[PDB]
Amino acid sequence: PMEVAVCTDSAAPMWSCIVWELHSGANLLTYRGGQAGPRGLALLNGEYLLAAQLGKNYISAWELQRKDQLQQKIMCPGPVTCLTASPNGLYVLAGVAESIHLWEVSTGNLLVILSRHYQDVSCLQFTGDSSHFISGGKDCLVLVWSLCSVLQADIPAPRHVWSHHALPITDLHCGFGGPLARVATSSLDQTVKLWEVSSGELLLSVLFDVSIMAVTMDLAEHHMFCGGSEGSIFQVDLFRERSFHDAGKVFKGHRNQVTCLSVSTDGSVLLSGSHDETVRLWDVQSKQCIRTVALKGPVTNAAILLAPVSMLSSDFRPSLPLPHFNKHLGGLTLRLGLHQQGSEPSYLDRTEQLQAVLCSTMEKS
């Protein structure tokens, strides 16, 4: 299976987004447009590329096989600070100032606006099964939101209010699963915390000597990778209230704050984007850099992704068009028969039915 790196920068003189193969570094796709903001690049349903614009009040959209953006834009009442999409491709989340806007991809309806943060929303992330989403903010607050409670509410309140962090939240990372998932948070208070979604309890807290700008864990959650403000990536082995410094647990080479961190599917490769205008590939075992990709500005988005069939097929077109996303608060548009894909009768099912017809004809005639 092909793995790719989707990276954006704050300058974007020629391309606003570049996708290249992980193990070769050769560009696979390429998009032109404006400038994506930090934490403001989502990939919707494997067919579209949403990018919240840097300093603007709207979100641009792309088709995976076209370099020019679509005409439709997701306009917002204020500046867009972050943007995420549910892994099932059903909802879109954007942090507009202190509030979170939720859109239905089925209809384009702005379903809810969540206003519980008293400062700007810094980051947004869904759980693997798209049953919860977690929001961080400049108010040092991490909120756990149930999608079932938010969608069915007539104001909604978070499932958990995590206020242990004392400085604004910089990054979040949610593990696989829903209620049984674990969330890692980072903050300017030089601490990274690990939580439980179901109980709402703090499981771990690691203190560093510098502010942590990014955080990620592998799928098996063996390690926690923390990006420092001076260019150091720290590794925390997950096997309470620890502290760092350990010389062999640091990735060295970045000269500026590491704001993006991603791990490969097997966990053997670490992706790091930093403010020194460089995206780097690391070997998790040897802590040595494999590839150093230079960019034209500070990296705003950088992730490792399993390339969808859309990314490989040059003739791909999205199954449904992007709906008109409403700017203000039973008509679902969908394709029928998807639930029964692969349910066609097999050879022995078809053969035995025809043989039964033959036997019935023999008995009757």
């Binding site: 099964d129 049984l180 028969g337 639930h339 033959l358 019935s360 005639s365």
Partner: protein, 503 residues
């Protein structure tokens, strides 16, 4: 060659009729067809006379099913013409069933070849549809099957006869024969895809027309032989709507979820106490569970069509389920087991499509009412009766409970988990040590599945009884029933992960 000898063997045997289906099955098993010209000529010769038409049709079925690409391309048009000729021979109905069964595969494979598809759609399918429409009333099942095959693989070439096809299908959606009614409902639901953007519009108007007709029929019902005909029409139209919801369509459509849910709620909002006992009242009371069941399959079809997009209507759906359970609650079987089993199946399907977002048994009057109904249907209770009485509602309730606990268990309050422990742990050991639903091995397997689900997804404030459940699985792995013992052996492998961590 092997296949050549095995072909010449039955060529010489035929050139016997009671053995022919077995010979065709054996020839298909060896893959001899996939030499062949002799078989083609033999089938053509046998198809000429009524006395030998069954043998020719058997040979034709084998040839159509197992032909290579080149032979099929060579003989597809001739085979279609022979099938049509058989279809217009005034032969017994079984001959027509066999001919239609062959034609289904012939049309399925011909649609895969662009040249054959073009030639047939241009020059042969309207005549085939005319032959199917001209069949005798005794062969209406075969006619419906043939038209269904024609619209399945050549829907664009069926648009010229769309009105006659619609008239044929609409006359049999109220048929009293369940198989004919099902076939006619399946055929009618395929009409919006017939003909040359416009298909989306056709789907929408057809679905709204069905909704309006269903509302009128419900108004007629919720007011002798008239009521039975009304119920037959209602069931046919509801089945058609559900088939249109749950079947594949070639274009995106706008599903009016609010209108369908409104009709479902209206159907389920009338109970036994709403019906008077004078006049035709007892007849309406007798027919009411069937109407509620029709609404229940409509709800199932909507859930399948929309999936987790229905999460905004979860409050209404989770109020609906205990409402129906309340409306149909009473070695003797308890009444209304079909309705309760359908409700529990709908709950299981909703949890399947929603995951941990289902919100079932997670606080409220409806969550506690559903739990009360679920717990009573999984509880055990000279005379005439059955030892495994009430094992259908028990198994469905166990499946729904285990699915909900596995998916939404961590979000469920700990007192519910304690109640489930106190009910289930004495139950698994109570069957390992008269008339009971747990004399059925299916119910025992479902109870063990519920125990494993309680172990796997507990509340973060209530640890599950690991040791007692380990003893229960150990006892069940020694059971006589292979269904229960193998499941209990597999469950102990999962429990080894809960007992011997690797991290």
């Amino acid at each position: 060659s092997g296949p050549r000898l095995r072909l010449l063997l039955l060529e010489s045997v035929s050139g016997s009729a009671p053995h022919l289906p077995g010979l065709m099955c054996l020839l298909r098993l060896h893959g001899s067809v996939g030499a062949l010209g002799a078989l083609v000529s033999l089938s053509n010769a046998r198809l000429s006379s009524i006395k030998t038409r069954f043998e020719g049709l058997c040979l034709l079925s084998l040839l159509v099913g197992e032909s290579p690409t080149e032979l099929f391309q060579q003989h597809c048009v001739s085979w279609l013409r022979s099938i049509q000729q058989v279809l217009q021979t005034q032969d017994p109905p079984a001959t027509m069933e066999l001919a239609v069964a062959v034609l289904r595969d012939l049309l399925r494979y011909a649609a895969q070849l662009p040249a054959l598809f073009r030639d047939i759609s241009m020059n042969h399918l309207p005549g085939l549809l005319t032959s199917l429409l001209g069949l005798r009333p005794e062969c209406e099942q075969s006619a419906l099957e043939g038209m269904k095959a024609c619209m399945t693989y050549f829907p664009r070439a069926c648009g010229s006869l769309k009105g006659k096809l619609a008239s044929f299908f609409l006359s049999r959606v109220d048929a009293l024969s369940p198989q004919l009614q099902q076939l006619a409902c399946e055929c009618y639901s395929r009409l919006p895809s017939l003909g040359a953007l416009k298909h989306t519009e056709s789907w929408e108007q057809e679905l709204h027309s069905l909704l309006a007709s269903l509302h009128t029929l419900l108004g007629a019902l919720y007011e002798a032989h008239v009521l039975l005909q009304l119920r037959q029409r209602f069931s046919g139209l509801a089945r058609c709507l559900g088939l249109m919801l749950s079947s594949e369509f070639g274009a995106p459509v706008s599903v009016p979820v609010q209108e369908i849910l409104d009709f479902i709620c209206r159907t389920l909002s009338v109970s036994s106490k709403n019906i008077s006992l004078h006049g035709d009242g007892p007849l309406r009371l007798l027919l009411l569970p069937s109407i509620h069941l029709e609404a229940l399959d409509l709800l199932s079809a909507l859930i399948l069509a929309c999936g987790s997009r229905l999460l905004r209507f979860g409050i209404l759906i989770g109020r609906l389920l205990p409402q129906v359970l309340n409306s149909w609650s009473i070695g003797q079987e308890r009444p209304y087991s079909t309705v309760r089993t359908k409700v529990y199946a709908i709950l299981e399907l909703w949890v399947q499509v929603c995951g941990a977002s289902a919100g079932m048994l997670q606080g409220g009057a409806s969550g506690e009412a559903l739990l009360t109904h679920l717990l009573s249907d999984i509880s055990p209770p000279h005379r005439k009766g059955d030892s495994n009485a009430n094992s259908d509602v028990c198994a469905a309730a166990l499946r729904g409970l285990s699915r909900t606990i596995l998916m939404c268990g961590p979000l469920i309050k700990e007192e519910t988990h304690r109640r489930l422990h106190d009910l289930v742990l004495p139950l698994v050991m109570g069957v390992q040590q008269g008339s009971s639903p747990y004399t059925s091995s299916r119910c025992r397997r479902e109870l063990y599945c519920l125990l494993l689900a309680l172990l796997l997804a507990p509340s973060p404030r209530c640890p599950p009884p690991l040791a007692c459940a380990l003893q229960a699985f150990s006892l069940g792995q020694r059971e006589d029933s292979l269904e229960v013992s193998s499941f209990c052996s597999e469950a102990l492998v999962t429990c080894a992960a809960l007992t011997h961590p690797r991290v």
